[PDB]
Amino acid sequence: RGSASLPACPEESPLLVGPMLIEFNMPVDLELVAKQNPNVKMGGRYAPRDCVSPHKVAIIIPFRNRQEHLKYWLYYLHPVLQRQQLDYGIYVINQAGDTIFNRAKLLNVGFQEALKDYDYTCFVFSDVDLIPMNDHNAYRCFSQPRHISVAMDKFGFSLPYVQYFGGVSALSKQQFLTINGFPNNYWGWGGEDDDIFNRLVFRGMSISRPNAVVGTTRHIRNPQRFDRIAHTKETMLSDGLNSLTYQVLDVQRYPLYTQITVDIGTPS
């Protein structure tokens, strides 16, 4: 007998089911999704009741006018994240306006704003249109920067090239800070993920990946390696989290996610 703390959650969750059937041909009603996921709290926050997870994860989704894709993302990922026993929150970073979309800058915004809410220590950066096909593909951080979407159906279930880091990735707070976050000036130029990969390598990090069999993803309807090595080395410490500027225009907590609408400026 005696007062005692809740145990850490196990290394691997015993709740995982493995393969999942992913389809995008039926309607989704978020009110029904919330009712089927009653343990997910306002703003799309969840943590296990019976154990403490070492994975305090902010899932950051760059976004603009793709509500149907987001509804599928929520419908599929909330059950998966709870089965993975993560202490997580969902952040949809909505780019205000009509100017060119800037994926990497919105991801940086997500890192900085999610930290205002809670002491997250792991960050998953996910396009809104990528859904995992196996729940053994952990949505959390590892000893090295994690590439999650490693075998995408749109690329024939094969990695485009070994240095490809697009789609869905995860970086611990330490990993993200040491590369000064992501570049802010990729205004649809292409290759922002290759720049991120170059930053990680320059800092001595490598890429961790799940086994490809469980790393498969479906895309809701072959890239090549843009080169920028010298450029990334030149600019990574002066363009990134330290130089990030934006204005928060709206913050909405919905039952299944927090949506932060931001004005990130225009190409300079």
Tab-separated table of N, CA, C and O in Angstrom, residues 43-147:
chain	number	residue	atom	x	y	z
A	43	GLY	N	-10.074	21.833	-28.548
A	43	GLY	CA	-8.850	22.202	-29.248
A	43	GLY	C	-8.151	20.975	-29.816
A	43	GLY	O	-7.053	21.077	-30.356
A	44	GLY	N	-8.769	19.798	-29.682
A	44	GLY	CA	-8.165	18.583	-30.211
A	44	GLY	C	-6.995	18.078	-29.361
A	44	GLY	O	-5.943	17.716	-29.889
A	45	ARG	N	-7.186	18.080	-28.048
A	45	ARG	CA	-6.165	17.658	-27.093
A	45	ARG	C	-6.527	16.335	-26.450
A	45	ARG	O	-7.663	16.136	-26.024
A	46	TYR	N	-5.527	15.476	-26.298
A	46	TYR	CA	-5.731	14.175	-25.681
A	46	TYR	C	-4.465	13.659	-25.014
A	46	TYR	O	-3.364	13.950	-25.459
A	47	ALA	N	-4.650	12.925	-23.915
A	47	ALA	CA	-3.535	12.255	-23.251
A	47	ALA	C	-4.174	11.054	-22.551
A	47	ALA	O	-5.331	11.115	-22.088
A	48	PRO	N	-3.438	9.960	-22.469
A	48	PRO	CA	-3.954	8.748	-21.811
A	48	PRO	C	-4.392	9.008	-20.375
A	48	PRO	O	-3.874	9.879	-19.690
A	49	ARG	N	-5.374	8.237	-19.928
A	49	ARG	CA	-5.846	8.386	-18.568
A	49	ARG	C	-5.066	7.531	-17.588
A	49	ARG	O	-4.848	7.964	-16.443
A	50	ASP	N	-4.621	6.352	-18.034
A	50	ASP	CA	-3.986	5.386	-17.141
A	50	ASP	C	-2.459	5.313	-17.103
A	50	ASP	O	-1.893	4.590	-16.291
A	51	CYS	N	-1.812	6.068	-17.973
A	51	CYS	CA	-0.359	6.114	-18.006
A	51	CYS	C	0.092	7.481	-18.476
A	51	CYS	O	-0.702	8.264	-19.025
A	52	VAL	N	1.374	7.779	-18.273
A	52	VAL	CA	1.915	9.091	-18.684
A	52	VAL	C	2.814	8.869	-19.888
A	52	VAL	O	3.751	8.072	-19.847
A	53	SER	N	2.539	9.568	-20.965
A	53	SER	CA	3.346	9.390	-22.163
A	53	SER	C	4.548	10.312	-22.189
A	53	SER	O	4.452	11.466	-21.791
A	54	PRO	N	5.701	9.799	-22.620
A	54	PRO	CA	6.867	10.682	-22.705
A	54	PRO	C	6.742	11.485	-24.023
A	54	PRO	O	7.539	12.396	-24.277
A	55	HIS	N	5.740	11.156	-24.850
A	55	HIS	CA	5.541	11.860	-26.141
A	55	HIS	C	4.535	12.988	-26.021
A	55	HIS	O	3.322	12.748	-26.011
A	56	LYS	N	5.046	14.207	-25.839
A	56	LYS	CA	4.202	15.411	-25.709
A	56	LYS	C	4.327	16.032	-27.085
A	56	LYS	O	5.265	16.800	-27.359
A	57	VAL	N	3.331	15.725	-27.927
A	57	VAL	CA	3.377	16.040	-29.348
A	57	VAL	C	2.401	17.089	-29.899
A	57	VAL	O	1.190	16.956	-29.723
A	58	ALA	N	2.922	18.115	-30.561
A	58	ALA	CA	2.036	19.108	-31.221
A	58	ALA	C	2.074	18.686	-32.680
A	58	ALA	O	3.153	18.536	-33.259
A	59	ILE	N	0.899	18.403	-33.247
A	59	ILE	CA	0.827	18.000	-34.648
A	59	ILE	C	0.402	19.261	-35.372
A	59	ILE	O	-0.670	19.849	-35.108
A	60	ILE	N	1.278	19.657	-36.284
A	60	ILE	CA	1.167	20.924	-37.012
A	60	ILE	C	0.827	20.681	-38.465
A	60	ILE	O	1.594	20.041	-39.157
A	61	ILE	N	-0.291	21.260	-38.916
A	61	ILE	CA	-0.776	21.072	-40.273
A	61	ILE	C	-0.896	22.435	-40.970
A	61	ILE	O	-1.701	23.260	-40.565
A	62	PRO	N	-0.075	22.680	-41.989
A	62	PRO	CA	-0.081	23.924	-42.768
A	62	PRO	C	-1.393	23.828	-43.578
A	62	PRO	O	-1.745	22.761	-44.070
A	63	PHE	N	-2.112	24.927	-43.735
A	63	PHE	CA	-3.441	24.812	-44.326
A	63	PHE	C	-3.972	26.052	-44.997
A	63	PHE	O	-3.622	27.168	-44.661
A	64	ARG	N	-4.857	25.809	-45.949
A	64	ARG	CA	-5.620	26.892	-46.549
A	64	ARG	C	-6.700	26.345	-47.435
A	64	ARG	O	-6.392	25.730	-48.433
A	65	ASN	N	-7.946	26.546	-47.020
A	65	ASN	CA	-9.122	26.175	-47.808
A	65	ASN	C	-9.196	24.736	-48.282
A	65	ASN	O	-9.438	24.471	-49.474
A	66	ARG	N	-8.922	23.799	-47.381
A	66	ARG	CA	-9.043	22.397	-47.764
A	66	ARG	C	-9.795	21.728	-46.630
A	66	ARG	O	-9.320	20.787	-45.982
A	67	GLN	N	-10.987	22.246	-46.357
A	67	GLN	CA	-11.747	21.687	-45.254
A	67	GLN	C	-12.145	20.225	-45.458
A	67	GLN	O	-12.229	19.487	-44.481
A	68	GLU	N	-12.433	19.805	-46.695
A	68	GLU	CA	-12.798	18.409	-46.906
A	68	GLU	C	-11.596	17.500	-46.590
A	68	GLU	O	-11.758	16.463	-45.944
A	69	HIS	N	-10.393	17.902	-46.998
A	69	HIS	CA	-9.219	17.083	-46.664
A	69	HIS	C	-9.038	17.038	-45.134
A	69	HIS	O	-8.754	15.992	-44.575
A	70	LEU	N	-9.191	18.178	-44.466
A	70	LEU	CA	-9.011	18.229	-43.005
A	70	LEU	C	-9.986	17.315	-42.282
A	70	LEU	O	-9.625	16.666	-41.296
A	71	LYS	N	-11.241	17.275	-42.751
A	71	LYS	CA	-12.218	16.415	-42.125
A	71	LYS	C	-11.768	14.959	-42.258
A	71	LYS	O	-11.928	14.215	-41.315
A	72	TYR	N	-11.214	14.552	-43.406
A	72	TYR	CA	-10.731	13.162	-43.545
A	72	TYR	C	-9.521	12.946	-42.598
A	72	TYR	O	-9.384	11.887	-41.963
A	73	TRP	N	-8.631	13.935	-42.533
A	73	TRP	CA	-7.457	13.830	-41.675
A	73	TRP	C	-7.869	13.602	-40.209
A	73	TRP	O	-7.370	12.698	-39.535
A	74	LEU	N	-8.826	14.398	-39.729
A	74	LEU	CA	-9.300	14.264	-38.373
A	74	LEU	C	-9.964	12.912	-38.109
A	74	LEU	O	-9.725	12.277	-37.074
A	75	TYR	N	-10.824	12.517	-39.044
A	75	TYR	CA	-11.567	11.271	-38.978
A	75	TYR	C	-10.614	10.092	-38.826
A	75	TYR	O	-10.802	9.238	-37.947
A	76	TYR	N	-9.552	10.088	-39.633
A	76	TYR	CA	-8.583	8.992	-39.554
A	76	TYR	C	-7.533	9.085	-38.449
A	76	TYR	O	-7.265	8.094	-37.767
A	77	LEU	N	-6.938	10.255	-38.261
A	77	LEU	CA	-5.862	10.355	-37.281
A	77	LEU	C	-6.254	10.377	-35.816
A	77	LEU	O	-5.516	9.837	-34.996
A	78	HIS	N	-7.403	10.967	-35.439
A	78	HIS	CA	-7.663	10.954	-33.999
A	78	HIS	C	-7.674	9.555	-33.371
A	78	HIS	O	-7.084	9.346	-32.310
A	79	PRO	N	-8.338	8.576	-34.002
A	79	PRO	CA	-8.320	7.244	-33.398
A	79	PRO	C	-6.904	6.680	-33.318
A	79	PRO	O	-6.564	6.058	-32.330
A	80	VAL	N	-6.103	6.910	-34.357
A	80	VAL	CA	-4.725	6.418	-34.423
A	80	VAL	C	-3.859	7.035	-33.312
A	80	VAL	O	-3.116	6.332	-32.614
A	81	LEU	N	-3.942	8.349	-33.162
A	81	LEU	CA	-3.129	9.026	-32.142
A	81	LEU	C	-3.496	8.572	-30.723
A	81	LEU	O	-2.628	8.425	-29.882
A	82	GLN	N	-4.777	8.336	-30.450
A	82	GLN	CA	-5.162	7.842	-29.135
A	82	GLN	C	-4.650	6.408	-28.955
A	82	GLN	O	-4.205	6.058	-27.873
A	83	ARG	N	-4.679	5.581	-30.008
A	83	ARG	CA	-4.170	4.212	-29.857
A	83	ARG	C	-2.686	4.213	-29.625
A	83	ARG	O	-2.181	3.305	-28.981
A	84	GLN	N	-2.015	5.252	-30.131
A	84	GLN	CA	-0.583	5.382	-29.916
A	84	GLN	C	-0.235	5.962	-28.540
A	84	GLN	O	0.932	6.170	-28.243
A	85	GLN	N	-1.254	6.223	-27.717
A	85	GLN	CA	-1.054	6.705	-26.333
A	85	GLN	C	-0.215	7.997	-26.218
A	85	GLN	O	0.538	8.171	-25.274
A	86	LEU	N	-0.407	8.913	-27.160
A	86	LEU	CA	0.356	10.164	-27.180
A	86	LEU	C	-0.361	11.238	-26.385
A	86	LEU	O	-1.576	11.167	-26.212
A	87	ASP	N	0.406	12.203	-25.851
A	87	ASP	CA	-0.151	13.337	-25.118
A	87	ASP	C	-0.058	14.369	-26.243
A	87	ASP	O	0.987	15.017	-26.403
A	88	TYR	N	-1.148	14.568	-26.997
A	88	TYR	CA	-1.034	15.405	-28.185
A	88	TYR	C	-2.051	16.519	-28.351
A	88	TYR	O	-3.029	16.584	-27.620
A	89	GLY	N	-1.759	17.397	-29.293
A	89	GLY	CA	-2.684	18.479	-29.653
A	89	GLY	C	-2.573	18.697	-31.142
A	89	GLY	O	-1.480	18.596	-31.722
A	90	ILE	N	-3.696	19.033	-31.769
A	90	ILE	CA	-3.747	19.297	-33.211
A	90	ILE	C	-3.813	20.810	-33.494
A	90	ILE	O	-4.688	21.525	-32.964
A	91	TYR	N	-2.902	21.283	-34.333
A	91	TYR	CA	-2.841	22.675	-34.712
A	91	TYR	C	-2.919	22.840	-36.230
A	91	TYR	O	-2.027	22.423	-36.949
A	92	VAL	N	-3.974	23.484	-36.711
A	92	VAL	CA	-4.128	23.754	-38.138
A	92	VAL	C	-3.715	25.213	-38.313
A	92	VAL	O	-4.326	26.102	-37.730
A	93	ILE	N	-2.638	25.440	-39.051
A	93	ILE	CA	-2.104	26.787	-39.243
A	93	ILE	C	-2.600	27.248	-40.616
A	93	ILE	O	-2.090	26.845	-41.672
A	94	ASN	N	-3.613	28.105	-40.547
A	94	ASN	CA	-4.375	28.614	-41.699
A	94	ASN	C	-3.757	29.900	-42.246
A	94	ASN	O	-3.691	30.899	-41.532
A	95	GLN	N	-3.293	29.868	-43.493
A	95	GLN	CA	-2.701	31.068	-44.083
A	95	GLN	C	-3.791	32.029	-44.544
A	95	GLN	O	-4.607	31.698	-45.431
A	96	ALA	N	-3.825	33.203	-43.936
A	96	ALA	CA	-4.815	34.209	-44.285
A	96	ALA	C	-4.476	34.775	-45.631
A	96	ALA	O	-3.304	34.786	-46.049
A	97	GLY	N	-5.507	35.264	-46.316
A	97	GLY	CA	-5.271	35.895	-47.596
A	97	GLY	C	-5.260	34.996	-48.787
A	97	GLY	O	-5.572	33.816	-48.676
A	98	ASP	N	-4.841	35.578	-49.913
A	98	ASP	CA	-4.804	34.915	-51.208
A	98	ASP	C	-3.422	34.816	-51.844
A	98	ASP	O	-3.322	34.360	-52.982
A	99	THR	N	-2.369	35.245	-51.140
A	99	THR	CA	-0.984	35.205	-51.650
A	99	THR	C	-0.437	33.776	-51.718
A	99	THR	O	-1.039	32.840	-51.174
A	100	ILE	N	0.710	33.623	-52.374
A	100	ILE	CA	1.326	32.323	-52.537
A	100	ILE	C	1.472	31.576	-51.190
A	100	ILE	O	1.894	32.143	-50.187
A	101	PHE	N	1.096	30.305	-51.199
A	101	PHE	CA	1.171	29.454	-50.013
A	101	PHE	C	2.641	29.204	-49.632
A	101	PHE	O	3.488	29.035	-50.499
A	102	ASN	N	2.911	29.114	-48.336
A	102	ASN	CA	4.278	28.950	-47.838
A	102	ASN	C	4.251	27.908	-46.715
A	102	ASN	O	4.140	28.231	-45.534
A	103	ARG	N	4.366	26.661	-47.127
A	103	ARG	CA	4.303	25.536	-46.219
A	103	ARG	C	5.277	25.610	-45.051
A	103	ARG	O	4.866	25.476	-43.895
A	104	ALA	N	6.550	25.847	-45.340
A	104	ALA	CA	7.564	25.849	-44.276
A	104	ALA	C	7.393	26.981	-43.271
A	104	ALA	O	7.655	26.803	-42.070
A	105	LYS	N	6.964	28.139	-43.744
A	105	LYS	CA	6.783	29.221	-42.807
A	105	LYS	C	5.613	28.953	-41.877
A	105	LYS	O	5.658	29.296	-40.692
A	106	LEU	N	4.553	28.344	-42.397
A	106	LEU	CA	3.413	28.013	-41.545
A	106	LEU	C	3.844	26.944	-40.527
A	106	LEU	O	3.351	26.960	-39.400
A	107	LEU	N	4.706	26.002	-40.913
A	107	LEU	CA	5.176	25.006	-39.933
A	107	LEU	C	5.924	25.707	-38.781
A	107	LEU	O	5.739	25.355	-37.615
A	108	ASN	N	6.754	26.703	-39.095
A	108	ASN	CA	7.468	27.412	-38.026
A	108	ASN	C	6.471	28.102	-37.112
A	108	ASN	O	6.645	28.140	-35.874
A	109	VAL	N	5.449	28.699	-37.714
A	109	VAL	CA	4.423	29.371	-36.920
A	109	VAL	C	3.778	28.355	-35.953
A	109	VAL	O	3.570	28.646	-34.759
A	110	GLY	N	3.516	27.159	-36.468
A	110	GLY	CA	2.889	26.134	-35.640
A	110	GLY	C	3.778	25.779	-34.441
A	110	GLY	O	3.293	25.610	-33.323
A	111	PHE	N	5.090	25.689	-34.660
A	111	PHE	CA	5.995	25.348	-33.561
A	111	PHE	C	5.905	26.422	-32.470
A	111	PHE	O	5.732	26.139	-31.289
A	112	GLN	N	6.006	27.673	-32.906
A	112	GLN	CA	6.021	28.774	-31.943
A	112	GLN	C	4.705	28.967	-31.213
A	112	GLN	O	4.704	29.214	-29.999
A	113	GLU	N	3.589	28.800	-31.915
A	113	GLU	CA	2.290	29.011	-31.253
A	113	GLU	C	1.908	27.834	-30.383
A	113	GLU	O	1.364	28.023	-29.292
A	114	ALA	N	2.211	26.604	-30.827
A	114	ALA	CA	1.850	25.431	-30.008
A	114	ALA	C	2.570	25.531	-28.662
A	114	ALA	O	2.008	25.149	-27.643
A	115	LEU	N	3.806	26.019	-28.669
A	115	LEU	CA	4.565	26.156	-27.416
A	115	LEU	C	3.938	27.154	-26.429
A	115	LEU	O	4.191	27.083	-25.226
A	116	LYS	N	3.137	28.082	-26.942
A	116	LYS	CA	2.460	29.035	-26.063
A	116	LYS	C	1.391	28.321	-25.269
A	116	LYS	O	1.105	28.709	-24.133
A	117	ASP	N	0.808	27.267	-25.842
A	117	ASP	CA	-0.248	26.507	-25.152
A	117	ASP	C	0.260	25.537	-24.112
A	117	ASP	O	-0.323	25.417	-23.028
A	118	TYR	N	1.344	24.819	-24.432
A	118	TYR	CA	1.783	23.726	-23.566
A	118	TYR	C	3.241	23.408	-23.841
A	118	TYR	O	3.740	23.716	-24.927
A	119	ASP	N	3.907	22.780	-22.877
A	119	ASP	CA	5.324	22.464	-23.052
A	119	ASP	C	5.534	21.220	-23.914
A	119	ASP	O	6.031	20.201	-23.432
A	120	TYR	N	5.130	21.306	-25.181
A	120	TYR	CA	5.350	20.208	-26.100
A	120	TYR	C	6.854	19.967	-26.286
A	120	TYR	O	7.659	20.914	-26.268
A	121	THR	N	7.247	18.709	-26.470
A	121	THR	CA	8.663	18.426	-26.687
A	121	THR	C	8.916	17.679	-27.978
A	121	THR	O	10.044	17.324	-28.284
A	122	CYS	N	7.844	17.475	-28.748
A	122	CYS	CA	7.953	16.788	-30.020
A	122	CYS	C	6.953	17.451	-30.974
A	122	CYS	O	5.832	17.826	-30.570
A	123	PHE	N	7.378	17.599	-32.220
A	123	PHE	CA	6.573	18.246	-33.243
A	123	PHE	C	6.422	17.421	-34.505
A	123	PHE	O	7.407	17.077	-35.111
A	124	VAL	N	5.178	17.059	-34.863
A	124	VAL	CA	4.946	16.341	-36.108
A	124	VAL	C	4.438	17.410	-37.088
A	124	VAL	O	3.513	18.150	-36.757
A	125	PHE	N	5.037	17.461	-38.268
A	125	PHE	CA	4.683	18.407	-39.316
A	125	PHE	C	4.044	17.557	-40.385
A	125	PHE	O	4.735	16.706	-40.999
A	126	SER	N	2.732	17.738	-40.577
A	126	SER	CA	2.021	16.924	-41.550
A	126	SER	C	1.188	17.652	-42.565
A	126	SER	O	0.355	18.495	-42.200
A	127	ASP	N	1.402	17.342	-43.840
A	127	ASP	CA	0.479	17.878	-44.839
A	127	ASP	C	-0.920	17.339	-44.456
A	127	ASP	O	-1.065	16.234	-43.909
A	128	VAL	N	-1.967	18.108	-44.790
A	128	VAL	CA	-3.325	17.747	-44.418
A	128	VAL	C	-3.877	16.602	-45.249
A	128	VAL	O	-4.864	15.984	-44.857
A	129	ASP	N	-3.203	16.301	-46.359
A	129	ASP	CA	-3.687	15.263	-47.269
A	129	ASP	C	-2.950	13.934	-47.279
A	129	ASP	O	-3.024	13.200	-48.280
A	130	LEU	N	-2.252	13.637	-46.187
A	130	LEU	CA	-1.509	12.378	-46.062
A	130	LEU	C	-2.039	11.652	-44.842
A	130	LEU	O	-2.080	12.198	-43.709
A	131	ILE	N	-2.433	10.396	-45.075
A	131	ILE	CA	-3.048	9.568	-44.050
A	131	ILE	C	-2.251	8.267	-43.940
A	131	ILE	O	-2.001	7.611	-44.966
A	132	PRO	N	-1.835	7.895	-42.712
A	132	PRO	CA	-1.061	6.665	-42.552
A	132	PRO	C	-1.926	5.420	-42.741
A	132	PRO	O	-3.105	5.412	-42.343
A	133	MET	N	-1.336	4.382	-43.340
A	133	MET	CA	-2.101	3.141	-43.564
A	133	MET	C	-1.823	2.081	-42.495
A	133	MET	O	-2.369	0.989	-42.533
A	134	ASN	N	-0.953	2.382	-41.537
A	134	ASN	CA	-0.662	1.385	-40.510
A	134	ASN	C	-0.381	2.126	-39.220
A	134	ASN	O	0.466	3.003	-39.199
A	135	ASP	N	-1.065	1.777	-38.144
A	135	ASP	CA	-0.834	2.493	-36.916
A	135	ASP	C	0.436	2.138	-36.147
A	135	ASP	O	0.703	2.678	-35.066
A	136	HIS	N	1.250	1.239	-36.723
A	136	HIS	CA	2.555	0.981	-36.113
A	136	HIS	C	3.533	2.109	-36.535
A	136	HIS	O	4.669	2.145	-36.058
A	137	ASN	N	3.100	3.010	-37.417
A	137	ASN	CA	3.927	4.159	-37.865
A	137	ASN	C	3.727	5.259	-36.817
A	137	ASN	O	2.744	6.001	-36.845
A	138	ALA	N	4.666	5.334	-35.866
A	138	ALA	CA	4.550	6.249	-34.739
A	138	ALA	C	4.572	7.744	-35.078
A	138	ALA	O	5.522	8.228	-35.725
A	139	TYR	N	3.545	8.475	-34.622
A	139	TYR	CA	3.522	9.919	-34.861
A	139	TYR	C	4.214	10.643	-33.708
A	139	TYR	O	3.587	11.405	-32.970
A	140	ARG	N	5.515	10.382	-33.547
A	140	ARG	CA	6.265	11.025	-32.470
A	140	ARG	C	7.751	11.043	-32.765
A	140	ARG	O	8.172	10.620	-33.846
A	141	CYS	N	8.550	11.517	-31.811
A	141	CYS	CA	9.984	11.737	-32.080
A	141	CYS	C	10.928	10.611	-31.665
A	141	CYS	O	10.612	9.824	-30.759
A	142	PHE	N	12.106	10.592	-32.295
A	142	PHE	CA	13.105	9.553	-32.028
A	142	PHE	C	14.480	10.179	-31.813
A	142	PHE	O	14.589	11.405	-31.765
A	143	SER	N	15.518	9.340	-31.714
A	143	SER	CA	16.860	9.847	-31.455
A	143	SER	C	17.434	10.727	-32.573
A	143	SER	O	18.398	11.468	-32.375
A	144	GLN	N	16.863	10.587	-33.754
A	144	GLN	CA	17.228	11.402	-34.903
A	144	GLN	C	15.899	11.854	-35.536
A	144	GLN	O	14.834	11.230	-35.327
A	145	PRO	N	15.930	12.955	-36.281
A	145	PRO	CA	14.778	13.540	-36.989
A	145	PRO	C	14.048	12.387	-37.712
A	145	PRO	O	14.660	11.578	-38.421
A	146	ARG	N	12.726	12.343	-37.562
A	146	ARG	CA	11.972	11.221	-38.097
A	146	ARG	C	11.218	11.530	-39.371
A	146	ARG	O	10.459	12.532	-39.443
A	147	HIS	N	11.399	10.685	-40.394
A	147	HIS	CA	10.605	10.879	-41.599
A	147	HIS	C	9.508	9.850	-41.497
A	147	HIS	O	9.766	8.643	-41.396
